[PDB]
Design a protein around this ligand. Structure first.
Ligand SMILES: Cc1cc2nc3c(=O)[nH]c(=O)nc-3n(C[C@H](O)[C@H](O)[C@H](O)COP(=O)(O)O)c2cc1C
Ligand SMILES: Cc1cc2nc3c(=O)[nH]c(=O)nc-3n(C[C@H](O)[C@H](O)[C@H](O)COP(=O)(O)O)c2cc1C
Ligand SMILES: Cc1cc2nc3c(=O)[nH]c(=O)nc-3n(C[C@H](O)[C@H](O)[C@H](O)COP(=O)(O)O)c2cc1C
Ligand SMILES: Cc1cc2nc3c(=O)[nH]c(=O)nc-3n(C[C@H](O)[C@H](O)[C@H](O)COP(=O)(O)O)c2cc1C
Ligand SMILES: Cc1cc2nc3c(=O)[nH]c(=O)nc-3n(C[C@H](O)[C@H](O)[C@H](O)COP(=O)(O)O)c2cc1C
Ligand SMILES: Cc1cc2nc3c(=O)[nH]c(=O)nc-3n(C[C@H](O)[C@H](O)[C@H](O)COP(=O)(O)O)c2cc1C
Ligand SMILES: Cc1cc2nc3c(=O)[nH]c(=O)nc-3n(C[C@H](O)[C@H](O)[C@H](O)COP(=O)(O)O)c2cc1C
Ligand SMILES: Cc1cc2nc3c(=O)[nH]c(=O)nc-3n(C[C@H](O)[C@H](O)[C@H](O)COP(=O)(O)O)c2cc1C
Ligand SMILES: CC(C)=CCOP(=O)(O)O
Ligand SMILES: CC(C)=CCOP(=O)(O)O
Ligand SMILES: CC(C)=CCOP(=O)(O)O
Ligand SMILES: CC(C)=CCOP(=O)(O)O
Ligand SMILES: CC(C)=CCOP(=O)(O)O
Ligand SMILES: CC(C)=CCOP(=O)(O)O
Ligand SMILES: CC(C)=CCOP(=O)(O)O
Ligand SMILES: CC(C)=CCOP(=O)(O)O
Ligand SMILES: [K+]
Ligand SMILES: [K+]
Ligand SMILES: [K+]
Ligand SMILES: [K+]
Ligand SMILES: [K+]
Ligand SMILES: [K+]
Ligand SMILES: [K+]
Ligand SMILES: [K+]
Lengths: 207, 207, 207, 207, 207, 207, 207, 207
């Protein structure tokens, strides 16, 4: 397979819960193992913006997402916000790529400063120290200078800052097509196959 | 009226021509005077992403947009890319707010470095030196460190960096609802009334 | 009216609870709408330094402060520390000026780094990104280099750093006169009328 | 009225005393209240470059300028260089816009470093801390890196650096027309009406 | 006595709980007063890495540690994570040296940014502002650039960054000898006598 | 004795002359030798804010302060603003701690830039180069970025920035109790005994 | 002869075409060889601000300027904007001093960033790399922070930033006298004799 | 095979010679080719801290280490400190990963500054310029700001700073278990299999 076998997928409390659920679904369809983390605020976002009725506790959440996605037993792990016995908490874990989608400005801040206050933040700290892939998907507008400095610091350290800023150059017809644009770029970044977004100009030879 | 009487609206060659056309339409409906500039690349974007058949030359373009938007005679000015006799080229002009929507990474760069190679770039240079409003609406993903440094520099100088990163917390049902989210935030930034996006929590008293 | 119609007033756990209560009282007397937030540590400060017996929960706190201040029904809103449905949590809210009085070194830090861990910190993050007024009133001595760097960063971004450092040039006779000095400068900063502190030299013509 | 009711006008010892006297005259004609400060070196410049015989002491200077300008009694205040009882010395004063015209490199330095050695320098320090308008009009050539760093620091803090560098694009015919160009840009910066310099392109609709 | 009479000893959730317990034991044997703080994560580390069954609540923990160490009544104080009435929370307290051993990357971050979210972090903030000794003992590998920037900032402000990186130049024979190496260097840093690690070259006169 | 035998006490022209006079009184009561310096502006502040009728010339001022404070002959030295033969002007002098209380923004600037224009500024320059204690007590609000950069630079070089920002956590009942709070913190900083402000939590053992 | 034998004189599209034409005339009268470059925008400025009817193409322009200035055949070279075979394009050319007069903000930007988009910009890039004289004469007001950073960078690298900011201390009587002031300072900078501006104080011996 | 076929292993004169010998042994057992370099000071460390009697000259050292490790002929190359004909001296060499274990503060400095004074330092310079793996294993405590700046610079350039700071979370029972912890993390960093340190949480599915 091309790309990572295991992805840590963290959802934090920015608007755009649809992006994180669609990415989860694509990762599952690509037979990847997902270590799923979700913040309390992201739970409130998902309740507000979607009709997904996500259970609160990790085992119930795991059972629910496995069914929602059509996943295999064991394919989605769920870990709670203080579960330091989970693989993402240590750099001695097997290597995973990590994506924070969506990424709140508060989570962006914590990652940029090294605040390590829950498993999402620690997981990101471990990805950086181990030089494992780290993709942040912020959703905010305007971005203040606070936000921008935090994104620049992490981009300079090799994190990929991938704003939830979809393109329109494949004539999107629905909200889903815009969601899938962003998801496709995340999968592209990770080196995971996707067929939602064609390869630009692949068939163009000259002019 | 609340907000500026005159807006310089520059469209550059990032994906998201729909945002610039919808903002133009809203500004016209709010009885504002618009000084419209468009780059050659933005013309190619508009041809690719939309069914708007925009004429190439400024007078024909002006006639076309006046009709497209339902504007009054004289309400949309169009100026070509080297027209230094246009108001935006000089800080001795009457004051305008300026929005670059969408803003390509190349236009972002030119504004951040002071490159003054066409009227859009000069207009932005004048807005900064005169401390007149300047709003950039970049559409790109990932953002590299190049992009982020350019956005940070301009944000620190009082430009508003407003990525084309719509929210989902009003349960959007169509591409248009996402377009209108971004447009609403631009109008909010400018201090121009809009009723596309409600005032969050306006009716919430306690808890 | 001169100055903002709505002020977000956040009290955090620095010494100087008297300043925040007096400012609240002045804002109420000036017929402003106040969105009141208070941290858990600020509750402990208020219990230690004052004889105000503030209820713990937002609705009871709202009822209590409305009575304490002589406010109109609805004039003081109180929002709890995780209430993301409150106006201050979103930049799509109606615009407010925000004052953090007093501002702990920990809240100063969170605002400077963009940590967004409760509604006070998120509210400040939103004020900065929206270029809405943000006034911090730190109370600390000595200030370390940590403190000073955090204040400088925010001052450079247009926040007003207004230490709780009263002047003596109007011959204060009581603790209240010193409290009112600081409050007056906050109201001056906000553009709200006050008659506690005269306009210096207003009547001086020459020499 | 558009623009500030009160301007603090400080003349320092750069060449270009004509600019400061013409601005004073325009401000008076626009019915503004002027708080006038002049350095000892600026007195020597005025004696060298002009035929204005300015008295040395503040009351005599005030009487003289009131007559020279056709001002109303009380409209021009003059304050001496150590008069800390004057409004500009305190941020608790009524708000004024401040212009230093012309601005010597030494005054530029003092403002950039916060040196507070006379009332002009303190007044500028107060304008910055209160986020009241501050316009500096340097006259120097070449500018060294010392000069440029000082101007950049203050520009980054929201001061307007407006060099005495007139334009020629309205075909000036006299020294006075060049003086009036610079004065017009200062008044433009302050938001005060002026009809010396037309609004560029105001009548240009297309091309 | 040489060295401080009172040490604030904070244990945070890095691996190396043995270092903190051994330092506590040495401090007790040197008749020092210890103000002991421990984070929730450090409690989980101690449970995982050692057979010390530490009670959870401060009074029970105090009784337990007094017995474990052979301490005098009152010699070990224990304070909970929000106990702002404890001496370390205020710079008006009697002076203490502070050691964070072990120091997690998250606690390192909080100290470097001034986040003041529990008593350990506030205590460190107070040590820095009062220019009282502050020793951090990080245990992490690799160190990322996040970690290193945080350590550099604090080292530049006079904190001692003392990694849990034992030496081998006294031919250690056990895990305990390595633990005691690090502890000895902490005591050396604090100016407290120790005889675990000889003074290098003390008896070497020439060559 | 604990703390320095000799303190250079400089009063500059910020509001808060009461702080400097009370500190002088405490230092005298602690049998310290004081080298007293006062700026011309500080003389004007003392005349405005207090009923102390301080003579202008150093010998008369010395006689006056010796009486005002109950000092021993020779215990208060007074030196004029250009007296380079005074001990504070040279690092070859016997070592003193220096406190600038209150510290104007102009004196803060001069110390931060090394301007050495009077004996107070030179004395501070000498304290820094000799790594002798230097405590600045600024009184200003808001602090601008100018102020904050100057304070940060000096704090990074080991000066203590101690704003005149009293605490309220010992339930102050008078202006004097607030003055004494600040004075106590200065004496704490210097290592001089004081009993105005208790040691926080000294009697708290657990919880 | 004192000063350079060859000057590259580039005119760019800032207001102040009179300065560039007068400098050209003085250089010709001093028997210097001039390599003349002019941007398209500078052609539009010259048409607007002057009655010089400058031909568009380099050979016609050369013939025209030779006549306008009274120059010898071959004394004024003109090179077009993409003529890389011209001496200024290579550092292996014979050495020239270069002056950009007037210098637009866009040309200032290009030189500061190394953009090399036409022969003027490349010529400046070559002057810097060869440590040959480079004088920029900007004409703009206000200068923004963009402008100032670009000028500072180049000043730090040894370029001379000489704003078109004439002095008045030789009692100018006409627009020409102000033009000649600036020209004189450029010639002074280059080490070329001029008698338009006397040597200040040359005859002053004492006082 | 996973990971690099060739590792340049440099031992420098920090304490911790055991780490370098154990890593050498593991690399040999994993059938990797090792290019071994050792500094003169590291020879003195090995003599002091271990009972390995390492010959001084490269051929004798090679024979000795081949036997000590059970290596194949040709599997360990040894190169002397000025042998510029060795592969590590040139980026045109076949690619190797490089580890400096242990890394003295002096070698850390040389690598950070580009000092190229022996083959170890040149080899590291080549690894950085070729973007080949470079892992430094410093052993020092405290780390000064000198050390930390050097580590930060190299970490920012993509070197891995892996302090000799073992963890205790697998209940180490001997000095060897601590040595093997660090070695395992180096092998993890390099992508070489190891079974000394389990993959954290690999078997944890939920909670
Ligand atoms: C409905 C809703 C939408 C939100 N949208 C955003 C958003 O788009 N971006 C953002 O940075 N925060 C947003 N927030 C706020 C955060 O959720 C808040 O700052 C929180 O502290 C983030 O915490 P977390 O990073 O632990 O998830 C939203 C909150 C809610 C309830
Ligand atoms: C269909 C199309 C879509 C594009 N989308 C983007 C985009 O989303 N962001 C971007 O920075 N550039 C985009 N580009 C590229 C630019 O248009 C290109 O870099 C151009 O030089 C911008 O020039 P301008 O700033 O003068 O408009 C796009 C180009 C085309 C043709
Ligand atoms: C009585 C009392 C007084 C305090 N005084 C201060 C103070 O003056 N400045 C400060 O930064 N923290 C002070 N603190 C500490 C904070 O309250 C503490 O650092 C807390 O974490 C701040 O949290 P908050 O920012 O969420 O309110 C005080 C605490 C108490 C209990
Ligand atoms: C006739 C004359 C012209 C001057 N022209 C300038 C000038 O153009 N720019 C400048 O920075 N200083 C000029 N100076 C010098 C200053 O006046 C001098 O540096 C002085 O210290 C400025 O002090 P001030 O800032 O208190 O006015 C001039 C002085 C005189 C006497
Ligand atoms: C068994 C165990 C070992 C840990 N080892 C480390 C470590 O060596 N370094 C580290 O920075 N964090 C380590 N952590 C993680 C932290 O404990 C986590 O990031 C936590 O948020 C730190 O919180 P604290 O600073 O409040 O103690 C470990 C956690 C556990 C459970
Ligand atoms: C009554 C009075 C009160 C003042 N209060 C302050 C103040 O609180 N802070 C300040 O920086 N300057 C204050 N100033 C201004 C200064 O005294 C002024 O900037 C002066 O140049 C300081 O000079 P010095 O540093 O030599 O004492 C005050 C002046 C007077 C007359
Ligand atoms: C009449 C006229 C006057 C101008 N005045 C200025 C000016 O004073 N300063 C400036 O930076 N640009 C001025 N401009 C704008 C520039 O000419 C424009 O930004 C252009 O892109 C500069 O290109 P160039 O650097 O290749 O000459 C002026 C333009 C015209 C037409
Ligand atoms: C026994 C011994 C132990 C040493 N331990 C260390 C150490 O732990 N860290 C360190 O930086 N230097 C240590 N040094 C010092 C260095 O070896 C010394 O600074 C040397 O110049 C390093 O040179 P190199 O980098 O060429 O190996 C030690 C030296 C000896 C003899
Ligand atoms: C949860 C845990 C074992 C953290 C330690 O991991 P690492 O050694 O810091 O990568
Ligand atoms: C097009 C034109 C007149 C540019 C000059 O404007 P400004 O004086 O630089 O603001
Ligand atoms: C609570 C909420 C709707 C946060 C999103 O606000 P914004 O779009 O980030 O200004
Ligand atoms: C002259 C005077 C009262 C200075 C104090 O003003 P502010 O409180 O520093 O703004
Ligand atoms: C817990 C408490 C009294 C904090 C205030 O201490 P300090 O005045 O900030 O050193
Ligand atoms: C007044 C005097 C002797 C200044 C010289 O002191 P130092 O040698 O600069 O410390
Ligand atoms: C036009 C040309 C030969 C450019 C190369 O010049 P140089 O070697 O870069 O100074
Ligand atoms: C020892 C040698 C051939 C050094 C040159 O290598 P490279 O071309 O600098 O990578
Ligand atoms: K959470
Ligand atoms: K174009
Ligand atoms: K709270
Ligand atoms: K003066
Ligand atoms: K805790
Ligand atoms: K003085
Ligand atoms: K051109
Ligand atoms: K060597």
């Amino acid at each position: 397979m091309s790309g990572p076998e295991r992805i840590t997928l963290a959802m934090t409390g920015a608007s755009g819960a649809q992006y994180g659920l669609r990415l989860l679904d694509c990762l599952v369809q690509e037979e990847r193992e997902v270590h799923f983390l979700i913040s309390k605020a992201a739970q409130l976002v998902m309740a507000t913006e979607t009709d997904v009725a996500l259970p609160a506790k990790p085992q119930a959440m795991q059972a629910f997402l496995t069914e929602y996605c059509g996943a295999a037993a064991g394919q989605i792990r769920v870990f709670g916000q203080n579960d330091w016995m989970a693989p993402p908490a240590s750099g001695s874990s097997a290597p995973n790529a990590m994506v924070i989608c969506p990424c709140s400005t508060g989570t962006l801040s914590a990652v940029a400063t090294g605040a390590c206050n829950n498993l999402i933040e620690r997981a990101a700290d471990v990805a950086l120290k181990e030089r494992r892939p780290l993709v942040l998907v912020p959703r905010e507008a305007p971005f203040s200078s606070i936000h921008l400095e935090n994104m620049l610091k992490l981009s300079n350290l090799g994190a990929v800052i991938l704003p939830a800023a979809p393109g329109f150059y494949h004539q999107p017809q629905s909200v889903e097509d815009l969601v899938d644009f962003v998801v496709a770029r995340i999968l592209n970044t990770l080196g995971i196959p996707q067929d939602m977004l064609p390869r630009w100009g692949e068939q163009h030879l000259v002019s």
